[PDB]
Amino acid sequence: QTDMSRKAFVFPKESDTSYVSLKAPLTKPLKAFTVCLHFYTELSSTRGYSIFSYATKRQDNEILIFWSKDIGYSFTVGGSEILFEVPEVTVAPVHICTSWESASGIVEFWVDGKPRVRKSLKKGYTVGAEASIILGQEQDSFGGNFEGSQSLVGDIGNVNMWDFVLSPDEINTIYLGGPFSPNVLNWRALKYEVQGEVFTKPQLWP
Amino acid sequence: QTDMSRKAFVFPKESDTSYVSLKAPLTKPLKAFTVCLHFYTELSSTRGYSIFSYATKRQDNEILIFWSKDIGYSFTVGGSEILFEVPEVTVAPVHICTSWESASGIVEFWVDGKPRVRKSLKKGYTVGAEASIILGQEQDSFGGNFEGSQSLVGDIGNVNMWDFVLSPDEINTIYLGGPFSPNVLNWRALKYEVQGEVFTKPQLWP
Amino acid sequence: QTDMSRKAFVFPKESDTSYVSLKAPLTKPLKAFTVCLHFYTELSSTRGYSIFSYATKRQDNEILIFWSKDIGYSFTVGGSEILFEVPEVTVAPVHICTSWESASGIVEFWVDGKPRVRKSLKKGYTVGAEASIILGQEQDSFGGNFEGSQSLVGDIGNVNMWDFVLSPDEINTIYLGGPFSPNVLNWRALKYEVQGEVFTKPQLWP
Amino acid sequence: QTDMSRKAFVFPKESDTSYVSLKAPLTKPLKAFTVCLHFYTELSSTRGYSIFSYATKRQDNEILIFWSKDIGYSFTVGGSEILFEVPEVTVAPVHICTSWESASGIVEFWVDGKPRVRKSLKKGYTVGAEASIILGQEQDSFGGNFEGSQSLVGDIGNVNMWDFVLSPDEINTIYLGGPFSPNVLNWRALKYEVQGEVFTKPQLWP
Amino acid sequence: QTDMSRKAFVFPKESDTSYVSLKAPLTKPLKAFTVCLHFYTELSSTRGYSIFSYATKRQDNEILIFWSKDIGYSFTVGGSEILFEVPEVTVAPVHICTSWESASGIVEFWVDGKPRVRKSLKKGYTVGAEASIILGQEQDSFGGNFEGSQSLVGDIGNVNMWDFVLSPDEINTIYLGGPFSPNVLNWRALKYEVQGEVFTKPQLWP
Ligand SMILES: C[C@@H]1O[C@@H](O[C@H]2[C@H](O[C@@H]3[C@@H](O)[C@@H](O)[C@@H](O[C@H]4[C@H](O)[C@@H](O)[C@H](O)O[C@@H]4CO)O[C@H]3C)O[C@H](CO)[C@H](O)[C@@H]2OP(=O)(O)OC(CO)CO)[C@H](O)[C@H](O)[C@H]1O
Ligand SMILES: C[C@@H]1O[C@@H](O[C@H]2[C@H](O[C@@H]3[C@@H](O)[C@@H](O)[C@@H](O[C@H]4[C@H](O)[C@@H](O)[C@H](O)O[C@@H]4CO)O[C@H]3C)O[C@H](CO)[C@H](O)[C@@H]2OP(=O)(O)OC(CO)CO)[C@H](O)[C@H](O)[C@H]1O
Ligand SMILES: C[C@@H]1O[C@@H](O[C@H]2[C@H](O[C@@H]3[C@@H](O)[C@@H](O)[C@@H](O[C@H]4[C@H](O)[C@@H](O)[C@H](O)O[C@@H]4CO)O[C@H]3C)O[C@H](CO)[C@H](O)[C@@H]2OP(=O)(O)OC(CO)CO)[C@H](O)[C@H](O)[C@H]1O
Ligand SMILES: C[C@@H]1O[C@@H](O[C@H]2[C@H](O[C@@H]3[C@@H](O)[C@@H](O)[C@@H](O[C@H]4[C@H](O)[C@@H](O)[C@H](O)O[C@@H]4CO)O[C@H]3C)O[C@H](CO)[C@H](O)[C@@H]2OP(=O)(O)OC(CO)CO)[C@H](O)[C@H](O)[C@H]1O
Ligand SMILES: C[C@@H]1O[C@@H](O[C@H]2[C@H](O[C@@H]3[C@@H](O)[C@@H](O)[C@@H](O[C@H]4[C@H](O)[C@@H](O)[C@H](O)O[C@@H]4CO)O[C@H]3C)O[C@H](CO)[C@H](O)[C@@H]2OP(=O)(O)OC(CO)CO)[C@H](O)[C@H](O)[C@H]1O
Ligand SMILES: [Ca+2]
Ligand SMILES: [Ca+2]
Ligand SMILES: [Ca+2]
Ligand SMILES: [Ca+2]
Ligand SMILES: [Ca+2]
Ligand SMILES: [Ca+2]
Ligand SMILES: [Ca+2]
Ligand SMILES: [Ca+2]
Ligand SMILES: [Ca+2]
Ligand SMILES: [Ca+2]
């Protein structure tokens, strides 16, 4: 019931102890999902980092969004990874939405409201329910074994997660800032635990 | 009567077994034609691919639209090919309209509503009626004999065909999204058969 | 009285036998003139071509507009030539308006409604009335001796001619598309003769 | 009482004598602060310079804003420095806002109304009250020991200072030109002393 | 009282005989001045030229505005010169406004309504009243000893002069074609003498 509207988490130092852990209530296994977030960092030209870590007991990298230096975005599900290449790197806040479906196997990536081509990953796969969701590091185990080089220095916010694939119209609505009701992770009724040096401050982006 | 408005075909893998075959009812030979379609792919900098294949018993490549690496668009009628060069490649959905007339031999190409210079090809020629129209591969014979390296990975839609040449005003109307009534292939009353791994999903372009 | 509004001449092949000859009624010698036209061609990066050819018995090149490869526009009157250099070549329809005055010698050139610096050429010279006006090839005699390398492939239209110099306001009016009444060549009351492979088709530019 | 709206200070020559010294009334030690100013100079591609100098008896560089050639902006507090790199240099007036908070240690930088990533500097530190605030040179003692190479030649104005951090909405209001009431330095109620060749003239920027 | 609104002087050839001399009525020495003018030439990439020449018996270069190849604008007063460097060269009409004041020595330069940094030159200096103002060449004596290499080929107009410095608001008004009343040189009440080949034609710029 902690409303984090018009607020963002700030990691101002490079460390291996600062992070935030989010909690989801569901227990039914996931067959399709959508994740949307807003982030701002200046490490693109210096090294790679992690934007969203979702780990289960069996697999550490179950749903992970990564930035790889000189290559671009890396979306990994169930241990298998696809690359979305960006040639030019910009300095400004970035809004990313991602969606994955099981029966079809299609993966959709939206960067700042503009879609990328559709790819394929892990057809006929089930994502576990009991899991740890971490912002700040890229978990090599179940909520532990963090890596300093894979940390994030900057601001993160507007983290929402659904349990079904969103249509383009709803993605445009989210980008513009209309109303919506996520059913996995809600930015207006969020449960979280903060460990280390993490701060909560007004968001820079509009 | 399968209305396909606001929907598109998705090919998410490189294969030689996935395609869609469309059907047309007419039997009178064709002396002039127009084809308009929308597509999105990320293979421009990697290899060439087919966008529209039209095959008859005598000729495999009767009306074919192709992309040639480092060169640009290739329009082939009756086995004779002409080239429309594009030096700059952009990553975004593309709308193409093409028209051919027999008495004059003029060929008209419109990319995103902006026309290209008119060229000449295959004057005094008749295009057969009984034919196979395939999206997904470039048929080297009648339906079949598919080329693995000439497949299309990505999204395709808004395929419309007329049996007469269109004036610039009508092409502008098509680009902006007004009403029209094609008489060979209609995206509101389409007959089609899908083979392989081809999906039907909401369109990404507006 | 053949109204040629919303229409254009198309030369789709490179040849030395296709041209269009226009007729003018006046007989009083010329001491100042203005010529306005629209054209579209993709030969800028390959070779040169002639846009407007005007020839008399004494001089084959009385008023000629040319494009010289890697240099730019070339305006020649009475056999003497001046150059307007453009470093960047664009692919789109081009509207050019030129004007010359005798008592002063100033030559004005307008490309896409934006003027170029004023230059001097052939002061105190009279241009003959009995002449042949040709689009398609540059003339080396009185309506003959065409050169293949100097031909035009593409579209031409909106050819108008006045026997006096126009003010900038009227040039802007012409470019935008207002009304005017030329007194030498009128695109609404044109007399013409077509020889070879020349087609009359709806224009591409607005 | 000396309202300085629509006015600016001009240093037109490079010297080590010209400067302006401003006065602040408060005596309570500072735990957070914000500084906003507008400046215009053409020395970016030649050498460095100081935009805002704030010195105390213990340290000469307590709050100093600097420009370093080929690097960019340098914000130094308590003797510790952090860099904000700009690769592209432009010729136009620049508006800069900076903010520092002690409990968090976060430093915020805004250039032309667009925020930079948040960084960390000097957590748990107190800034003295009795201080000398100088525009024109970068002090190396308490109001003395100026350096010619570090002087500023150009225009400076719209200097305002608060003793608390500002929200992004208030920063946008300041940039647009709305009303506000600073409580340390007020451009409408300034106390100042001008020494050397410094002039007061209408501001160039809107 | 020869109103010259919507008219401009044209020099279409390079020579050392064509020029226009303007007359001013005042006899009180000058302590501050402002000069505004519009010009169009294509010689920037070829050589230098003079835009405004102001000469007296003692000094030939009293108020001279010049263009130096590969460097940019050169403003010279009383024989001492300062440079305003432009790295990029454009092809379009240019509007320049320059201002000088004696008590402070500040020199102000406005190109196309955008200010440049303020610089210092000739503090405590008086400009003579009895003088020759020439457009067309850069006088090396009292209205004589012209130089061909330093001539201007192109168009000039909207020449106005004030005997006091102008605030930025009035400069913006001038750039937008508002009303004003100069008291040294008035483009609506000009006294001029034309010698050589100089023409009066409608202005190209709006
Ligand atoms: C434990 C293991 O972690 C993942 O591997 C990640 C790898 O990082 C290594 C650690 O995982 C850890 O094993 C060790 O590496 C040792 C390794 O354990 C040992 O067997 C071998 O002999 O020596 C290695 C030392 O180099 O320390 C680091 C190097 O990094 C690679 C990078 O490709 C993997 O991809 C994993 O990195 P990641 O967690 O950050 O995720 C990737 C980042 O892009 C995905 O994009 C494994 O994947 C398993 O989860 C687990 O078994
Ligand atoms: C004269 C032209 O010949 C063909 O040109 C195509 C050729 O592709 C080869 C064809 O031979 C194709 O049938 C296939 O043949 C295989 C196939 O298994 C079967 O025929 C035989 O048993 O084994 C053959 C082993 O190769 O092999 C391919 C490589 O090559 C040209 C260019 O070199 C074109 O690629 C043609 O194929 P395309 O469909 O892609 O043509 C497009 C036209 O623009 C490409 O732009 C044609 O098939 C016709 O026979 C004839 O026109
Ligand atoms: C008309 C006469 O010559 C013009 O020169 C043009 C020349 O074209 C050739 C002409 O000379 C033409 O008579 C013929 O040549 C004759 C001639 O007897 C002789 O050359 C030889 O015997 O062969 C022919 C038969 O006897 O062939 C043509 C090709 O080409 C030059 C090349 O620069 C000129 O440029 C003229 O051609 P152009 O129209 O294309 O000029 C363009 C202007 O930009 C080129 O850019 C000249 O105009 C003479 O002044 C004129 O008297
Ligand atoms: C306390 C000392 O001074 C500041 O650091 C500046 C230093 O530059 C020197 C200045 O300190 C200045 O007084 C003088 O130095 C004296 C001093 O006695 C001693 O350092 C030297 O041996 O003799 C000099 C004459 O007595 O000369 C300058 C060079 O070190 C750096 C080097 O550039 C900077 O100059 C420091 O500050 P700055 O104002 O000069 O330049 C800015 C600093 O960021 C530009 O970024 C600080 O107080 C430090 O505590 C310490 O260095
Ligand atoms: C007297 C001199 O006049 C102007 O000088 C410009 C100079 O032009 C030369 C003149 O100096 C003129 O006397 C003569 O030069 C003499 C002189 O003895 C010497 O140059 C040479 O050895 O012998 C010549 C004949 O005996 O010839 C002309 C060309 O040239 C310089 C260098 O370019 C500048 O151009 C001088 O000023 P400017 O009018 O050309 O404008 C320049 C544009 O930037 C200045 O910025 C000037 O009025 C001098 O002040 C004055 O002393
Ligand atoms: Ca991991
Ligand atoms: Ca790891
Ligand atoms: Ca084929
Ligand atoms: Ca093939
Ligand atoms: Ca000729
Ligand atoms: Ca010729
Ligand atoms: Ca110091
Ligand atoms: Ca110093
Ligand atoms: Ca001189
Ligand atoms: Ca000279």
- The DSSP line for chain C is -B--TTEEEEE-S--SS-EEEE-----S-BSEEEEEEEEE-S-TTT--EEEEEEE-SS-S-SEEEEEETTTEEEEEETTEEEEEE-SS---S-EEEEEEEETTT-EEEEEETTEE---EE--TT--B-SS-EEEESS--SSSS----GGG---EEEEEEEEESSPPPHHHHHHHHHT-----SSB-TTSB-EEEESS-EEEE-S--
SS3 call for A172: helix
Around ligand 3, the residues with Cβ closer than 6 Å are C 60-61, 66, 74, 138, 140, 145, 147, 150
Q: Are strands A199-201 and A63-68 parallel, antiparallel or unpaired?
A: unpaired
Q: What residues are paired with C34 via a beta bridge?
A: C99, C162
Q: How far is the CA of B168 from the centre of ligand 3 (A)?
A: 40
Q: Which whole-number Å values give the CA distances from C5 to A27, B172, C8, C157, in the listed order?
A: 71, 19, 8, 9
| Tokens, residue C129 | 């009335």
CA dist D166 and D148 (Å) reads 34
Q: Which whole-number Å values give the CA distances from C182 to A155, B143, C60, C130, E202, in the listed order?
A: 66, 59, 25, 18, 21
Task: Look at residues D5, D6, D4, D2 and name the one whose alpha carbon lies nearest to residue D204.
Answer: D6
Contact B12/A120, CB-based, under 8 Å?
A: yes
| Tokens, residue B94 | 């593309």
Positive or negative torsion for Cα C101, C105, C106, C109: positive
Q: Tell whether C2 lies on the interface with E, counting CB pairs under 8 A.
A: no
SS3 call for E48: coil
Q: Tell whether D103 lies on the interface with A, counting CB pairs under 8 A.
A: no
CA dist C191 and C131 (Å) reads 14
Beta-carbon contacts of residue B186 (< 8 Å; ≥ 6 apart): B160
Beta-carbon contacts of residue B189 (< 8 Å; ≥ 6 apart): B1, B2, B3
SS3 call for D92: coil
* Nearest ligand (C-alpha, residue B76): 2
**Is D touching B (3+ C-beta pairs, cut-off 8 A)?**
no
SS3 call for D175: helix
Q: How far is the CA of D64 from the centre of ligand 4 (A)?
A: 13
Task: Look at residues D114, D105, D126, D117 and name the one whose alpha carbon lies nearest to residue D175.
Answer: D114
CA dist C161 and C23 (Å) reads 12
Task: Look at residues C128, C99, C131 and name the one whose alpha carbon lies nearest to residue C32.
Answer: C99
Nearest CA to ligand 2 atom 30: B140
SS3 call for B168: helix
Q: Could you tell me how many helices (H) and strands (E) chain E has, helices first?
A: 1, 15
Q: Are strands A32-41 and A94-101 parallel, antiparallel or unpaired?
A: antiparallel
| Tokens, residue D70 | 């080929």
CB B37 within 8 A of CB B171: no
> Which residue in chain C has the smallest CA separation from B105?
C12
Cβ burial of E190 (10 Å; 0-12, 13-18, 19+) is: middle
CA distance B117 to chain C (A): 6
Buried b (16+ CB within 10 A) or exposed e, B2-15: eebeeebbbbbeeb
Q: What residues are paired with D11 via a beta bridge?
A: D154
Nearest CA to ligand 1 atom 27: A147
CA dist E204 and C143 (Å) reads 36
Contacts of D155 in chain E (CB under 8 A): 117-118
Q: Is the CB of B146 under 6 A from ligand 2?
A: no
Q: Which whole-number Å values give the CA distances from A58 to A61, A125, C144, E185, in the listed order?
A: 9, 14, 86, 87
CB D50 within 8 A of CB D117: no
Q: Tell whether A194 lies on the interface with D, counting CB pairs under 8 A.
A: no
SS3 call for D59: coil
What's A6's DSSP letter?
T
CB C128 within 8 A of CB C96: no
Of A104, A116, A168, the CB nearest to B202: A168
Task: Look at residues D40, D19, D18 and name the one whose alpha carbon lies nearest to residue D205.
Answer: D40
CA distance A167 to chain B (A): 7
**Contact pairs from chain B to chain C, CB under 8 Å:** 29
Buried b (16+ CB within 10 A) or exposed e, C54-90: bbbeebbbbbbbbbeeeebbbbbbbeeeeebeeeeee
CA dist E133 and E60 (Å) reads 11
The rounded radius of gyration (Å) of the Cα atoms in chain E is 16
Task: Look at residues B22, B2, B9, B42 and name the one whose alpha carbon lies nearest to residue B202.
Answer: B9
Fold of B8-201: Jelly Rolls (2.60.120)
Chain E partners (3+ C-beta pairs within 8 A) = C, D
Q: Which of B7, B15, B199 to mutate to test the interface with A (most CBs of A within 10 A)?
A: B199
CA dist C67 and E1 (Å) reads 46
Q: Tell whether D12 lies on the interface with E, counting CB pairs under 8 A.
A: yes
- Name the resolution in angstroms: 2.8
CB D123 within 8 A of CB D102: yes
Q: Which ligand 1 atom minimizes the distance to the CA of A68? A: 44
Task: Look at residues E117, E116, E112 and name the one whose alpha carbon lies nearest to residue E172.
Answer: E112
Q: Tell whether E42 lies on the interface with C, counting CB pairs under 8 A.
A: yes
Contacts of C173 in chain E (CB under 8 A): none
Q: How many CA atoms lie within 13 A of D171 on its CB side?
A: 27
Q: Backbone phi, then psi, for E202, in 5-degree steps?
A: -60, 145
**For D82-163, where are the alpha helices, taking DSSP H only?**
none
Lookup result for tokens 């340290």: D59
* Cβ within 8 Å of C, B 122-181: 167-168
Q: Which of B110, B120, B121 to mutate to test the interface with C (most CBs of C within 10 A)?
A: B120
Q: Which ligand 5 atom minimizes the distance to the CA of E141? A: 48
CB D140 within 8 A of CB D149: no
Contact E167/D42, CB-based, under 8 Å?
A: no
What's E148's DSSP letter?
G
Q: Which ligand 4 atom minimizes the distance to the CA of D48? A: 45
Contacts of A14 in chain D (CB under 8 A): none
| Tokens, residue C42 | 């993709």
> Which residue in chain B has the smallest CA separation from C42?
B117
Around ligand 1, the residues with Cβ closer than 6 Å are A 60-61, 66, 74, 76, 81, 138, 140, 150
Cβ burial of D44 (10 Å; 0-12, 13-18, 19+) is: middle
Around ligand 5, the residues with Cβ closer than 6 Å are E 60-61, 66, 76, 81, 138, 140, 147
CA dist D60 and D56 (Å) reads 6
CA dist E114 and D28 (Å) reads 43
CB E106 within 8 A of CB E118: yes
Q: Backbone phi, then psi, for C200, in 5-degree steps?
A: -110, 115
Nearest CA to ligand 1 atom 6: A140
Q: Tell whether C43 lies on the interface with E, counting CB pairs under 8 A.
A: no
Contact E202/C117, CB-based, under 8 Å?
A: no
CA dist D42 and D45 (Å) reads 7
| Tokens, residue E38 | 């519009």
Buried b (16+ CB within 10 A) or exposed e, B188-204: eebebeeeebbbebebb
CA dist C184 and E161 (Å) reads 45
Beta-carbon contacts of residue C11 (< 8 Å; ≥ 6 apart): C18, C136, C151, C152, C153, C154, C155, C156, C197, C198
Of C117, C120, C167, the CB nearest to E42: C117
Q: How far is the CA of B141 from the centre of ligand 5 (A)?
A: 83
Query: In chain E, after which residues is the C-to-N distance over 2.5 Å, breaking the chain?
Result: none
Amino acid at E177: G
What's D82's DSSP letter?
E
SS3 call for E168: helix
CA dist C56 and D89 (Å) reads 58
Q: Could you tell me how many helices (H) and strands (E) chain B has, helices first?
A: 1, 15
Q: Tell whether E98 lies on the interface with C, counting CB pairs under 8 A.
A: no
Amino acid at B34: T
Complete DSSP assignment for A19-42: EEEE-----SPBSEEEEEEEEEES
Beta-carbon contacts of residue E25 (< 8 Å; ≥ 6 apart): none
Q: Which whole-number Å values give the CA distances from D61 to D83, D123, D134, in the listed order?
A: 15, 17, 11
Complete DSSP assignment for C120-165: E--TT--B-SS-EEEESS--SSSS----GGG---EEEEEEEEESSP
| Tokens, residue D196 | 């050397």
Q: Point out the annotated binding site of A.
A: 60-61, 138-140, 150
Q: Is the CB of D61 under 6 A from ligand 4?
A: yes
Q: D57's torsion region: left (phi>0), alpha (psi -120 to 50) or beta?
A: alpha
| Tokens, residue A175 | 């980008």
Method of elucidation: cryo-EM
Q: How many CA atoms lie within 13 A of D69 on its CB side?
A: 9
Contact E199/C119, CB-based, under 8 Å?
A: no
Q: Which whole-number Å values give the CA distances from D32 to B65, D65, D170, in the listed order?
A: 65, 16, 16
Q: Backbone phi, then psi, for E167, in 5-degree steps?
A: -70, 160
Q: How far is the CA of D68 from the centre of ligand 12 (A)?
A: 14
SS3 call for A160: strand
What's A5's DSSP letter?
T
CA dist C75 and C68 (Å) reads 10
D139 is in an annotated binding site: yes
Q: A97's torsion region: left (phi>0), alpha (psi -120 to 50) or beta?
A: beta
Q: Does CATH place domain C7-202 in 2.60.120.200?
A: yes
Contacts of D201 in chain E (CB under 8 A): 104, 106, 118
CA dist B81 and C125 (Å) reads 51
SS3 call for D34: strand
Chain A partners (3+ C-beta pairs within 8 A) = B, D
Could you tell which of D61, D64, D70, D147 is best to mutate to test the pocket of ligand 4, judged by most ligand atoms within 8 Å of the CB?
Answer: D61
Amino acid at A24: A
